[PDB]
Every structure is written in C-alpha cells, then in structure tokens.
Design a protein around this ligand. Sequence first.
Ligand SMILES: OC[C@H]1O[C@H](OC[C@H]2O[C@H](O)[C@H](O)[C@@H](O)[C@@H]2O)[C@H](O)[C@@H](O)[C@@H]1O
Ligand SMILES: OC[C@H]1O[C@H](OC[C@H]2O[C@H](O)[C@H](O)[C@@H](O)[C@@H]2O)[C@H](O)[C@@H](O)[C@@H]1O
Ligand SMILES: [Cl-]
Ligand SMILES: [Zn+2]
Ligand SMILES: [Zn+2]
Lengths: 304, 306
Amino acid sequence: GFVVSVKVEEEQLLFALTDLNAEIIENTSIPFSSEKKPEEAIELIAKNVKKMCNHLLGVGIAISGLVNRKKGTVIRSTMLGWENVALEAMLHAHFPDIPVYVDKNINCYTLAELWLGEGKQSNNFATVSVGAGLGLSVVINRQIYYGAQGGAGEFGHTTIQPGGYKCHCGQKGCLEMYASEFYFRNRGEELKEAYPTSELNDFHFDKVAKSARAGDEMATELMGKMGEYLGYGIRNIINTFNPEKVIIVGEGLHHRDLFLTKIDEIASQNFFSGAGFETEITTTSLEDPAWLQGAALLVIHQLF
Amino acid sequence: GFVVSVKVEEEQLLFALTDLNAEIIENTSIPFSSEKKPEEAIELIAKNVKKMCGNRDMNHLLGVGIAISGLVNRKKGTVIRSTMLGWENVALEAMLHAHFPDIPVYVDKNINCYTLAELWLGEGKQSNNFATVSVGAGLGLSVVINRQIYYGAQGGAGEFGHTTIQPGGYKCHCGQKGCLEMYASEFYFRNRGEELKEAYPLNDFHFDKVAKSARAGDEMATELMGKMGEYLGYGIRNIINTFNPEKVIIVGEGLHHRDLFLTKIDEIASQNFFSGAGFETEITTTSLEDPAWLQGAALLVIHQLF
Ligand SMILES: OC[C@H]1O[C@H](OC[C@H]2O[C@H](O)[C@H](O)[C@@H](O)[C@@H]2O)[C@H](O)[C@@H](O)[C@@H]1O
Ligand SMILES: OC[C@H]1O[C@H](OC[C@H]2O[C@H](O)[C@H](O)[C@@H](O)[C@@H]2O)[C@H](O)[C@@H](O)[C@@H]1O
Ligand SMILES: [Cl-]
Ligand SMILES: [Zn+2]
Ligand SMILES: [Zn+2]
C-alpha cells in the first residue's frame, strides 16, 4: 500500500514513495529542465514513477501555475512555459488504473502543514513560500481557499512596483520579480558594471547567499533588498487576510539567517499591530520533503 | 418594526430609518468632522437616531447599525483603530447604550456593510465568491467566500488600502509608506497635486472638485485622475490574482465620476494571471447607489436579530 508523489520544479523533478500516512519511504531528485518541455518531462516522470514501484494507489503531483484539479491539467505555468498540458491523461497512458492528482505546489505544502505541521492547531492561517518564486496558500476553516476556479493565491504576481521588472507572466513589477530568486538576476544584471570585482555571477539562491555571507558587496545588496520586498509582501498578506499567523516555507529558508529579520522588521509594522495586535510570523518546522508529503496527501485524502 | 442605520464618514455622519427589508424611509446627514472627536460624534449620533424615529413608538426600534472605517471589534462594538478618523479604542456601542440602554447596537466596517447590501439587494445576490472594492475617500475591500463575508482572525481582513503599491512612497495616515490608498483614492489628489503645483501654473483636492476640473480640461486634474485610475487598476489586478474571485464589484462615491477612470481600471486589471490563459474575470460597477452603505448597516442589524 503506497503512493508516489512528484514535485515539478523548473530545473529538477523530485519523487517520493510514501505510505498511507504520507511518511516518506524513498525520495529522489532528477536534474532536468522542464522549461517548454512538458512531453519529455512527463515521460521522465512516468519512467521514474515506474522505477520507484500493482499496489500503487495513486500519484500526486505538485506543480507551479494555474491547475485544473478536476481534469488534472496544467492550464498555465509561466514558471515552466507550459500551456494546457493534459498531465493526468498523459500519465494514464502509462498507468491506466492508477489515480493521478495535480495541485499547485504551495497548496500541496499547505496540506502537509495542516496534517503534520504548525497548521495542526490553526483554522485561519496563510502559508508563504520563499525560493525560486513566491507562493501563497490561504487556509480558511482548515480548508485551502481555491477561489472561483482554483487559481487563488498568485500572490507572486501582485504588482509591488508599477512599471518595474518584466515578469514571466507578461506583467511588469510583480512581487516575485523582487521577493524571490528572480530578483537576483533582474537586479544583479543591472549591477554588474558597478561591481566589477564581485565573485557573484550565478544568481541561484544558494550562490547569492554564499557570496553575501562571504561579504561580497553586490550579493549583500541583492539579498538585503530581496528581504525588504519579501517583508512588504508578507505585510500585504497580513493587511489583506488578517490571518491568525503567517507560516513561511520553502527552499529559500536554507538561507533564512540572511532575510528573516528583515521580513520581521517590515511585516510587523502592519495595520493591526498599529493598534497593538501582533500577527505571528513563523517558519515551518517541516523541511523540503514536505512538498512531496503534501502531494501524497493529495492522493490519500482522495481515498479516505 | 424599524431600524436606524448610521455611516460615520470623515467629514459627515449619515443616518437612515429603515423598515425590516432595509428600505429607506427617512434619512439625513450632518456635516461634522469626527476627526479626533468621538464623544461629540456619539452625542450627534444619539440626537439623530432620535430624529430619525420622529414621532414613532421607540419600543418598535429594533436596533441601530453603524458602518465605520477601520478595525472594529464587531462583538463588543468597539472601534479599535480607525486611522481615517484618528480614533483608537472608542467604545462606540457602550457609549451609545448609555443613551439607548435597551436596544441592540451593531458595528461593522463600512465596506462590509455595503457588501451585505450587495448580498441581499445587488450583484452579489447571485454569486458565492466575489470581491467588493470601494473607490472614493479611501480604498476598501470586502471578500465574500460562500455567501459569507471573510473577516479573518479578528475581523481585520480587507485592509487592502494599506497594502504597499509603491515602496518608499507617500506617507499614509496608517503610518506605513506607499499604501495603495495613497495612490488609488482621493488621497492621491492631495499627495501628488501638491508636487505638481510648479509644473502646472485647482486648490481643493476633494474627489468632486478634481473631477470637475478634469472634465473642464485642467491639465493637472486630468493627470491626477488618469494616474489614480491606473493605480486602482493595479489594485484590482492584485485582488484578482490573490483571490481569483468570480467577479469584482466596484462601489463607492468615487463612481459619481466613473467616466474619468473606469476605462483605465479595465485596461490594467483585465491583464491578470488568469486572463493570460483566456479566463476573463468580470469587473463591473454596482447597480446600487450611495444609500446602500446605510441599507447595509441596517441589514447588519436585521440579519443579526433574526
Ligand atoms: O517559493 C518557492 C517555490 O517557488 C515556486 O512556486 C511558487 C509560485 O511560483 C510562481 O509564482 C507560480 O506562478 C505559482 O503558481 C507558484 O506557487 C516554485 O515553482 C517552487 O518549486 C518553489 O518551491
Ligand atoms: O471607498 C470609499 C470609502 O472610503 C473609506 O472607506 C474605505 C476604507 O478606508 C480605509 O482604508 C479604512 O482603513 C478601511 O477600513 C475602509 O474600509 C471611507 O471611510 C468611506 O466613508 C468611503 O465610502
Ligand atoms: Cl513602510
Ligand atoms: Zn508576474
Ligand atoms: Zn496605509
């Protein structure tokens, strides 16, 4: 009795085999750029699901973008450049009598928080992810809020700087262009000429954090500003939702020492704290594999 | 039976007498700036509640509903924080009960009251997840999820006017810098208008006055009004990407001058995460009018009594 879950990131596919309590039995990571390559990615997924396995009760998939959870399709992921991808149908060519379920990445994480994490107690909280992009999932009554057609929570594509950086979504000035890994490239390209002896020219989160800790001037400017914008974003979430608490999650937390304080400084100055009512902003006690545990719970709740 | 409703604005107090369908029977408005004067406001409210009742059996007054800006504790009827008014911990319901100790008094945020009117009387009656956004003196939001207003943890949800649209921008009455309200409401006209004086050699920055000058062809007022509409567009875009509402209902006194900014909203807000995939979100103006703030505050009472 087992479930297989998948997280489709932009530069790697993650897999796990879990039991019926979403406890991980095995997990792996396959380097692959899925950008504009859904068919090839899905063949790799099928191959790697088969590799991990009769008593496969389902496959759960966490992915970026607008998903139709009813049909198992990826309507629009501008993170991946995927347009109307029939993910469930395509995997069912390989695994005919195995349920496939798809949901937005951060919604899957939030299922994990609800069942295993600091969303055990709470009934109204928000989950914000930091890393490659910026994600949001809001829980209202221990239920994820999906909005009219499952698209709620594209908080990364709220405008934080009108007229600012061009986003992958087609808009200018999206929060994700300032309050995620994308900022390091957007701003780092502009700063090259001013900082010609910077170590830094790979703008992945890890590399930027490494250089910032090493005292590189450009890297610390990038990391400092990204934290400020993330602070604005979390403040916005607070003033908008009045959540009981905000739970920060995501791979960016490997470098939390470089931005959490900045987030707290900004986000704790909010509409309700002006009256003396503080909103708790806390980091998840779950780790990176909870994206996969959550995608598994996607299947498990469909069963029971 | 009847109820009396009140809307506490920043420069006037509005009143209505209402039957139990929220139909307005009487109304009045007193020009009074309640800015840092809660005690005087309550005396005026008490006076005008009585005036609304007229010669009626006061025994038939079923309750009083009050629409107001800011963070309200809707259980105790306190105004915890209205930075629009400069009020903090005003025990509005208790102060009123001192005058009317034997009738219910209910308090809620202004745009929540309007949204009750949309739910019962308007374009919200036929929807289950929609967002209501008010334009005028400030920028309000109420979101309905399953035909219920979403209040969040302590009733504070929807301070969307105090999301940051321009980091480092205009100082807001809430204490933050760069709030959406400083760009997508009447406040923008003062904020930006003061900066544009030297560029355009209009001195009253109220919404009505700026609208008048913009229609008359005043370059400054036209520039103010266009940009305000752009910012309101971004605000509504953000609402859409955040909530994926079935629809957005625009409401408020700012709509008296809708022809000066509504097309700018649609241009910006229609470009959103879901419309990129061919799914349009309807953005429409309410068919209700200004008195629905008062009808909503009456519904606040009625639908808590019955
Ligand atoms: O925050 C870490 C997280 O970033 C992405 O997911 C968040 C977010 O990214 C874009 O805004 C999409 O439009 C949203 O639908 C996504 O929720 C990465 O995809 C994810 O792998 C990473 O953990
Ligand atoms: O939009 C017209 C409306 O503006 C104000 O109410 C909206 C909003 O103002 C601030 O952001 C407050 O902090 C919020 O609690 C309010 O909902 C005016 O107070 C109102 O009279 C007017 O109709
Ligand atoms: Cl600020
Ligand atoms: Zn974007
Ligand atoms: Zn503000």
